[PDB]
Design a binder for these strands. Structure first.
Ligand SMILES: [Cl-]
Ligand SMILES: [Cl-]
Ligand SMILES: [Mn+2]
Ligand code: NA
Ligand code: NA
Length: 325
DNA sequence: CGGCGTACG
DNA sequence: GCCG
């Protein structure tokens, strides 16, 4: 079992679901307290279990697994022995965890904002609605739409959204393409949002594209909220006899960068962090969603495919469905 | 012990 | 919290 998540296939569904979910609670709680190192270890330990070929049934099976030390092993031991880990359950029922989760789930609210509100004594969404002087326009939209945004986006919703995005993109720039990215490209059947990557086969033609796309979606009445090359929108999605609000991310990249943007926007989030960590620490190359830089030669690697990028990093290729770290 | 992804709005 |  290799130490980096980008070195091993991680399927969407696996054989250690309960154990990984427990460790991810502790990771999330660590993030709410600003403990980013402990968040990473618990995330990585959870991800290792996702990559295993069968269920962990005994503590000895953790021997030699990366990112399992005293703490993560004790969590697993307690779950194996009793079906519950007291620390995890303590976190789950705690007022701090529940409120930080509630608040950071709001579009426009991060950990720092949630924490300040928590310290001011705020606890519920209606507490926030009762003091709207303290909210940004983005937060106001996130609160207004919070119920709809809490409802899973389904794969059926995705195909409808892609068609309307392609229509606007085609008028904004004939020949431009729309690619589904994010969790749905990794095979997820539900999500929190839908992610699209837009490019054009003629380098440079994509410049200035996203404003033109957004203007056209707005004129079709499809945009409930928007604020360039990245857009974090709330879309009006038709429903039987009604509609619902859905978060949609639109991203534009030049075709020269498209493999890097596709890789970067297909995730998972942990997979990308691990991939960039691997690139820099093990290969001495700097990776982002625009390119891959050799800081000795001061040159950028040209990639024509995700396969190219995995090869340039010395990694076996993983299809999107195996990047569910 | 230092390090822990890396961008854009 | 864990790795190197
Ligand atoms: Cl930490
Ligand atoms: Cl980036
Ligand atoms: Mn998204
Ligand atoms: Na948020
Ligand atoms: Na997504």
């Amino acid at each position: 079992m290799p130490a980096y998540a980008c070195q091993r296939p991680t399927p969407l569904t696996h054989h250690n679901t309960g154990l990984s979910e427990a460790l991810e609670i502790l990771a999330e709680a660590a993030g709410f307290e600003g403990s980013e190192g402990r968040l990473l270890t618990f995330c990585r330990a959870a991800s290792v279990l996702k990559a295993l070929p069968s269920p962990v049934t005994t503590l000895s099976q953790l021997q030699g697994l990366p990112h399992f030390g005293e703490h993560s092993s004790r969590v697993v031991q307690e779950l194996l022995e009793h079906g519950v880990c007291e620390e995890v359950e303590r976190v789950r029922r705690s007022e701090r965890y529940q409120t930080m989760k509630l608040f950071t789930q709001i579009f426009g609210v991060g950990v720092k904002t949630a924490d300040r509100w928590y310290r001011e004594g705020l606890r519920t969404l209606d507490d926030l609605r009762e003091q709207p002087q303290k909210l940004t326009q983005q937060q106001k939209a996130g609160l207004q739409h919070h119920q709809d945004l809490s409802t899973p986006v389904l794969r059926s919703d995705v195909d409808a959204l892609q068609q309307v995005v392609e229509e606007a993109v085609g008028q904004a720039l004939p020949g431009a393409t729309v690619t589904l990215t994010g969790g749905f490209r990794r095979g997820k059947l539900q999500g929190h949002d839908v992610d699209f990557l837009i490019t054009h086969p003629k380098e440079g033609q994509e410049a200035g594209l996203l404003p033109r796309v957004m203007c056209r979606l707005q004129d079709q009445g499809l945009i409930l909220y928007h604020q360039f090359e990245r857009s974090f929108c709330i879309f009006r999605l038709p429903q039987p006899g009604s509609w619902k609000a859905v978060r949609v991310d639109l991203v534009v990249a030049p075709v020269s960068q498209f493999p890097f943007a596709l890789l970067g926007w297909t995730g998972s989030k942990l997979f990308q962090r691990e991939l960039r960590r691997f690139s820099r620490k093990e290969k001495g190359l700097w990776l982002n969603s625009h390119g891959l830089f050799d800081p000795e030669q001061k040159t950028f690697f040209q990639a024509a495919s995700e396969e190219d990028i995995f090869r340039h990093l010395g990694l076996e290729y993983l299809p999107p469905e195996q990047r569910n770290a």
